[PDB]
Write a protein that binds this ligand. Structure first.
Ligand code: ADP
Ligand code: ADP
Ligand code: ADP
Ligand code: ALF
Ligand code: ALF
Ligand code: ALF
Ligand code: MG
Ligand code: MG
Ligand code: MG
Ligand code: ZN
Ligand code: ZN
Ligand code: ZN
Ligand code: ZN
Lengths: 360, 334, 25, 343, 368, 365
């Protein structure tokens, strides 16, 4: 068994979710015969940098010809997919950082390709190379031989030397939106014949934070813990999704400066067992909604109708500056929550500071 | 390595997946110290490396079981910080990755255990990224950590997360009473200081930690009536300084809770000290001192080789300075 | 002294007052 | 064992020789002068062959033992010189020296040169055995107080008329480096055969080559000489000394001062000194430092030290020396506007 | 099939070099007079053309027509140098040739006369990567080299070279090219290549180049690839000019006027368009900064954004400096807070709401 | 075929040497009196003339006429030494011969008696680069030097050498040449070269030399190349402006004077050069801190800031301490805020403008 993130790797440009601009640029370059000798794909975590690089290599080294739509059936494509293609050399740039490795690699750039037409050096995680390695690379990257192509993939482009960036064609990937992630998850689950519900997929997409690998990992967690079913209850339990009015009650108690009730609610929540970061995020969202309502009475969305009245009351009592102050205090508490002796201690300290902030 | 009863349920889940050939190749277990996640990982490794498993339990007779008991199984790999040092280097990760490229000698699975992923350096994590992404066949990675939010995002985004939680306070108190013999208030205070982890409270009771806590409480009781906080240095300067700073922070937080009229307090065995702290200190000064203590604890735990005595002395001097009238207290920033 | 200044300080928003009007042109 | 000083060796050598000689110290100039004098006297007494070896576990003792046991074809009264390691003798080296001691005889003359031995190193079976028939020379670099006397004696020996101002200039420029002082005196004598060394003449032919230690910097800080402290810090920076040693050396004294000042309000100072086991000569300086500054100071200094350590370690910065200079000024009686302290 | 523009459009003569007038004039005067030194060092940023100037100097020295400031470019020596095949042009990769053994070999093989040319030109690239031993070995050879030996050095970081090496060489520091020169060079190259282009696309590419001309050429290649054979304003804006739109200025004006409804409508329109929030904050901060600079110096605003010049000047006349500083600080702090916000859009909305709440002139109404 | 001024113009007699009076006088007196030490060491900064003085001493020792302080320069030995062809003159380059097997082959050849000259001079340059075992062999040789062999050692950093070698050698430290001496030497060389010059150009070149006459000659060559055979003040000013690196101090001065136009011009110049902005802020902070230290005590500055000591002292004297503290705080806040600014240049400009005009409001209790 192979995990979903390792089984559903794209094999053609038609299978790539989003990143339309990069694919269009690559297709135009291949069609017009304007292939460059240095490509640097920079993006966030899990946005298909390695997949795009591998597909570009397949297109460059396809038997039929240089095409933007590799066949995927010729021997070159099959060997590249399997990973035992001689002319495609994939460096790690994390297990091989010393200058000797780079220097000996740069001494093998003269020999012609064994089987293919281009010698493709795919350097992944290139941001973990020493300065000497970059300096050695520079001149070869500037004017390499005709039969050699360099592909670079990094998640931290600002750690590279400026010259390295200037010597390469940069493609900046964009984080996938919620709808695209949800659609991809639905398609994958349909192909795999796994039950699912719209709410579960929506929650998983929202929690993915724009990374598809994270979405697939969460889906695998749900499948393992959901008895082979992606149900709303299982996803909510895994993600600790607040459902009742704990956030609103805590916000009201904090505004009223009733420390006793705040501490009682904190103790009750701890006894129940709740993810503190989710609670802080919900409180921040409620504060933002109250501020929006203060800006305009119609900002309140229908979704939070059950508490609308209560929300409006706060909008009629809390000055906007106090709302901003509470929002920033909760944000700071969220930032420092990992670096605390305990998560509950951090939450309590943040809420006590907010209680002490009463300017009236 | 002790097999606590409350680990029975979670195990029954995880092993089940490995029985169906649907187990993830990288498992990250989140658990507080003393929760026994190491025992769970060891049990899973023993089951995986057993050649003739008997249901959910290792046979204990096959060659794999014998080698694991003797701790000489060729296919079993462990990554732990070197003796004395408190970090895991890149060289060990590189060696393990290079070794993984070869087939298992016994023709079975290969298990790699990381004792604490939080100790990994940036270079080690980056080196391990690609290997974790596409490990060879029949390769399983087990990782353990306390707060998965500190691990590198790329490393986090390619592992199956499993969270462990402590049992209800009543069950933990009953278990501690069965094991340890102390007053109910002492057991409850130890459990709360341990963030609900039964194992940590047992560790605190077994040793001189309780005596150190009593000495710190006496020193603080002496210091609070007067303005002499520097005398606490003798009670704080020690290898286990973060724990004592945490104890002081809990005491200050309990004092603040009492000031606000709360009901539950972390320390339920020294009401007099909490009352004195609340009476003799204002809420703002308590908050400032708590923030300073937390920041100093974080600095001590993060920086490598930082001078303990100088930092503690500076903290005590600043705390004494704040108590003076007309002093601008610090404000949190981001 | 005003509560607005206190809130601004708490928010970390540093407020700057010009001291050399002649410098501007 | 006959203990002597480099200024009293010529008379002893003229009176007679000895089975072995030991030269321990830190100053290269005095050690080499004693070595040269001993070798010249030995040659005058018929010691022709001279051999030198550097003590090292890598070095083979078989050759040395064979040389000691063997006899030259057409020579007698050989001289053997052993350079001890800077760190000090080891147990294996101690055993080798003990073995060598037996091989010693009348013709062989042993000369040992190396750094001063500590209490543990001095305690050795071979050293105790040789103490009965050994002459030891104490070679300690004179302190700044003792330096002008040595400079005047050197000038008188070479038949040079040195003024007090010139003596002070030479002491200041070449403090802690006697070899530079001797070379400067030789160059000045060559420049002016008349030997009338006036202040301008010395000022026009002298360069800054002083050598210091962190202890000197801390002592200067305690005294309050801002110029001396800054000069010492600049010299330490130029010679390439890690600031960590400076910080750790200053930390102990700063904490001791803080504790003494805190406890001075209830106990006599002498009792505190006795309890803390402070050196007798340092008691006056410690009392002067305590009376010079109040609790307002020695508290901001701790903040400066902590901030400097954090900048050095967390941030890996390079402005450590500026912070050290600022702290040096703060310890001295200076305003120190306190914006830098970041209180 | 087409070769990269950067490699293809390499200056083969001193007339093709853009800018760097001082260095070219100095070299031409030196060659014409005959005062030729034996050690030249070139320093500057990336893409300024140190290597190109070194190659041109090598061509000038070794030309069959003699030592001339204007090499013919047709003689076999010039052709070989252009093709990188000349036997008397020893190019050293200091990045890979760092160990002192290579330097020792080079100095041992420095006495023999050149094969065909009148000089044996050693061009060491990235010299700053050599170890100290290599520098020390090269010291004496640089001091008294053979008459038929010339040394040319180029580096990006001359601050880490030994002081003696710097003393032993003639230094030439190249400065970054301005916007106008980069735009003119791009226009000329595109005209030669027969590719359609628009003035604003060239302006955006030149502004994004940031001195380095090789960066400009790479961005031009990206624009050509994106536009499918044409360099259009929309094509350039898709990848680079995602920012610099009138929406940012409209939002700034609305915030200045405390028009909450207008700000909310603009935010909704931007969200519909799919505008990156961090880029929007960056643009607002940039506009505020340029208004502040206009307040300081009237000449701060150049022709680059002349289209909005008038409007900007108005914002300089009315808004007091303190209000601008308050807005800038608030937006900067909101940017600090953006990563930890629950959502990027929510974070930007909260930042703008905070800015409106503390508006110096008309704060939002308080509860009663 | 014009020759480099540094290479063409080299000292040939002690009279030609500029400055370094004490070392020359000591050597002349020693040679006259017959007091010749077995080993000489020369130390100093770049371009002070260590190698030139060593070669002149070698000429003096082996001159045919005799052991004279001033060599004749006409006899065969002097000419051969000047041309580097003398039989008994050996110029060992320790930089390219740090290996032990290379130094041993010469320390063994030390045995043979000189063929022609009285002494077999061994001139070892860049001696500080030798290996430990090479130092041991050299120590042995210096411990047993034949009476017919002399050693001359030149090193810019004598600290690296073991203390034993220093003790067994007579040291001579060459002081950095003064501005007036460099200016006079440049004027003399240009007059002998028949090249037009201006006094201000010579003064600027001498100032830019920073005590190294070789740097002065290199800058003179650059000026001649730029000026088309004339050392004009305009060309020197243009060259110095192109290679000027004191922009941080100029920015500090402009900020103190509250002149926005000069600040903008300096910022544009820095942008053209490409200087890192964070490094610029760090340098400005360091300069302000050192000026404050100078105000506290004049002994803050040493030889490190000798290049710009006068300007720093003037700023310390003029600026009140409170303004310096305010500027330091403003620049520190600007450095803190720089990462979040959209452009580092933009952040630097904002920080400088804030320091110029916008006074921070000190937080209240
Ligand atoms: N843009 C994308 N389109 C399709 N799949 C993606 C995309 N981004 C990530 N993935 C998923 O992530 C896995 C590959 O990781 P990838 O994103 O290529 O690594 P990188 O972090 O280098 O981009 C695949 O299983 C794939 O399904
Ligand atoms: N002054 C210039 N004029 C025209 N083109 C230039 C100039 N400088 C650089 N280039 C272009 O930039 C490319 C890279 O220049 P390069 O030789 O790398 O300079 P550097 O050595 O400073 O990096 C060249 O191929 C050239 O086409
Ligand atoms: N004292 C001096 N007088 C005249 N010229 C000098 C002096 N010192 C250095 N120079 C000039 O510097 C050039 C090279 O000197 P160099 O051998 O580099 O000295 P060093 O060994 O001290 O660096 C010579 O051509 C010489 O003209
Ligand atoms: F494979 Al990645 F960021 F997860 F490049
Ligand atoms: F080749 Al360069 F800066 F000279 F990139
Ligand atoms: F020749 Al030099 F220092 F440059 F001795
Ligand atoms: Mg990848
Ligand atoms: Mg180049
Ligand atoms: Mg020289
Ligand atoms: Zn194919
Ligand atoms: Zn078994
Ligand atoms: Zn030609
Ligand atoms: Zn002669």
């Amino acid at each position: 068994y192979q995990v979903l993130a390792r089984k559903w790797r794209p094999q053609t440009f038609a299978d790539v979710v989003g990143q339309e601009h990069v694919l269009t640029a690559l297709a135009n370059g291949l069609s017009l015969g304007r292939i460059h000798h240095a490509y640097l794909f920079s993006g966030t975590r899990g946005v298909g940098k390695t997949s795009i690089a591998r597909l570009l290599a397949k297109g460059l080294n396809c038997e039929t010809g240089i095409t933007a739509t590799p066949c995927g059936v010729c021997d070159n494509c099959r060997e590249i997919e399997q990973g035992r293609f001689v002319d495609l050399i994939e460096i790690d740039a994390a297990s091989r950082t010393k200058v000797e490795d780079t220097r000996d690699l740069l001494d093998n750039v003269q020999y012609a390709p064994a089987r293919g037409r281009f010698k493709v050096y795919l350097i992944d995680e290139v941001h973990m190379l020493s300065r000497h390695s970059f300096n050695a690379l520079l001149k070869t990257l500037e004017e390499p031989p005709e039969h050699v192509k360099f592909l670079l993939a990094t998640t931290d482009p600002q750690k590279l030397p400026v010259t390295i960036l200037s010597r390469c064609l940069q493609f900046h990937l964009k984080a996938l939106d919620v709808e695209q992630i949800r659609h991809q998850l639905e398609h994958i689950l349909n192909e795999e014949h796994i039950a699912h519900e719209p709410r579960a997929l929506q929650l998983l997409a929202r929690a993915a934070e724009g990374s598809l690998r994270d979405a697939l990992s969460l889906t695998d967690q749900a499948i393992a813990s959901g008895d082979g079913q992606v149900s709303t209850q299982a996803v909510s339990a895994m993600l600790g999704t607040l459902d009742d009015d704990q956030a609103l009650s805590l916000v009201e108690a904090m505004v009223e400066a009733n420390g006793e009730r705040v501490m009682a609610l904190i103790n009750e929540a701890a006894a129940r067992g709740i993810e503190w970061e989710a609670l802080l995020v919900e409180m921040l969202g409620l504060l933002h909604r109250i501020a929006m309502v203060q800006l305009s009475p119609a900002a309140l969305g229908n979704d939070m109708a059950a508490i609308e009245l209560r929300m409006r009351e706060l909008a009629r009592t809390i000055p906007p500056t106090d709302i901003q102050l509470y929002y920033q205090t909760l944000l700071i508490g969220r930032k420092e929550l990992p670096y605390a002796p305990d998560r509950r201690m951090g939450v309590e300290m943040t809420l006590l500071r907010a209680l002490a902030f009463h300017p009236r | 390595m002790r097999w606590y009863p409350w680990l029975r349920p979670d195990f029954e889940k995880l092993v089940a997946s490995y029985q169906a050939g649907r187990g993830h190749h990288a498992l990250l277990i989140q658990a507080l110290p003393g929760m026994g996640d190491d025992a769970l990982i060891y049990a899973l490794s023993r089951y995986l490396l057993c050649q003739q498993p008997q249901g959910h339990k290792s046979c204990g007779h096959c060659r794999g079981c014998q080698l694991m008991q003797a701790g000489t199984h060729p296919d079993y790999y462990t990554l732990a910080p070197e003796k004395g040092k408190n970090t895991l280097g890149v060289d060990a990760v590189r060696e393990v990755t290079e070794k993984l490229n070869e087939h298992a000698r016994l023709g079975g699975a290969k298990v790699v255990w990381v004792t604490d992923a939080a100790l990994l350096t940036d270079a080690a994590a980056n080196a391990l990224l690609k290997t974790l992404e596409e490990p060879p066949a029949e390769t399983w990675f087990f990782l353990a950590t306390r707060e998965p939010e500190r691990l590198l995002a790329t490393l986090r985004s390619r592992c199956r997360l499993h969270y462990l939680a402590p049992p209800p306070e009543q069950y933990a108190v009953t278990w501690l009473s069965r094991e340890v013999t102390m007053s109910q208030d002492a057991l409850l205070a130890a459990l709360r200081l341990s963030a609900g982890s039964p194992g940590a409270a047992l560790a605190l009771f077994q040793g001189d930690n309780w005596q150190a806590r009593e000495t710190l409480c006496q020193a603080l009781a002496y210091s609070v009536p007067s303005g002499d906080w520097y005398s606490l240095l003798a009670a704080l300067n020690h290898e286990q300084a973060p724990a004592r700073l945490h104890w002081l922070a809990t005491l200050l937080m309990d004092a603040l809770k009492r000031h606000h009229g709360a009901a539950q307090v972390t320390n339920v065995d020294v009401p007099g000290l909490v009352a004195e702290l609340a009476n003799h200190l204002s809420p703002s000064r308590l908050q400032a001192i708590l923030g300073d203590v937390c920041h100093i604890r974080e600095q001590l735990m993060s920086v490598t080789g930082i001078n303990r005595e100088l930092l503690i002395t500076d903290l005590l001097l600043r705390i004494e300075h704040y108590l003076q009238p007309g002093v601008v207290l610090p404000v949190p920033h981001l | 002294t005003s509560r607005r200044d206190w809130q601004l300080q708490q928010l970390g928003i540093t407020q700057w007052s010009l001291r050399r009007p002649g410098a501007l042109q | 064992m006959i203990r002597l000083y480099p200024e009293q060796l010529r008379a002893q050598l003229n009176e007679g020789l000895r089975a072995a000689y030991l030269l321990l110290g830190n100053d290269p100039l005095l050690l080499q002068e004693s070595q040269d004098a001993v070798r010249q006297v030995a040659a005058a007494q018929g010691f022709e062959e001279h051999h030198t070896f550097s003590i090292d576990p890598n070095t083979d003792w078989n050759a040395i033992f064979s040389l000691c046991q063997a006899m030259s074809l057409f020579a007698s009264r050989q001289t053997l010189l052993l350079l001890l390691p800077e760190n000090g003798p080891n147990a294996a080296i101690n055993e080798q020296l003990l073995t060598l001691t037996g091989l010693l005889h009348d013709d062989l003359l042993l000369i040992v040169r190396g750094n001063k031995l500590s209490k543990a190193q001095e305690n050795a079976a071979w050293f105790t055995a040789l103490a009965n028939r050994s002459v030891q020379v104490t070679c300690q670099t004179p302190e700044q107080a003792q330096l002008p006397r040595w400079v005047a004696a050197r000038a008188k020996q070479l038949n040079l008329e040195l003024d007090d101002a010139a003596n002070q200039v030479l002491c200041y420029c070449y403090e802690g480096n006697l070899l530079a002082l001797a070379q400067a005196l030789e160059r000045l004598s060559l420049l002016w055969p008349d030997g009338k060394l006036t202040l301008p003449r010395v000022e026009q032919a002298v360069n800054d080559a002083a050598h210091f230690t962190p202890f000197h910097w801390v002592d200067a800080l305690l005294m309050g000489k801002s110029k001396r402290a800054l000069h010492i810090l600049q010299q330490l920076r130029l010679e390439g000394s890690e600031p960590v040693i400076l910080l750790r050396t200053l930390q102990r004294e700063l904490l001791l001062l803080v504790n003494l000042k805190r406890q001075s309000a209830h106990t006599p100072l002498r009792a505190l000194f006795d309890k803390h086991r402070v050196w007798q000569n340092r008691r006056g300086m410690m009392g002067e430092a305590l009376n010079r500054l109040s609790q307002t100071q020695l508290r901001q200094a701790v903040q400066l030290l902590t901030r400097t350590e954090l900048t050095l370690k967390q941030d890996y910065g390079q402005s450590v020396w500026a912070e050290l200079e600022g702290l040096s000024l703060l310890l001295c009686h200076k305003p120190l506007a306190d914006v830098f302290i970041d209180g």
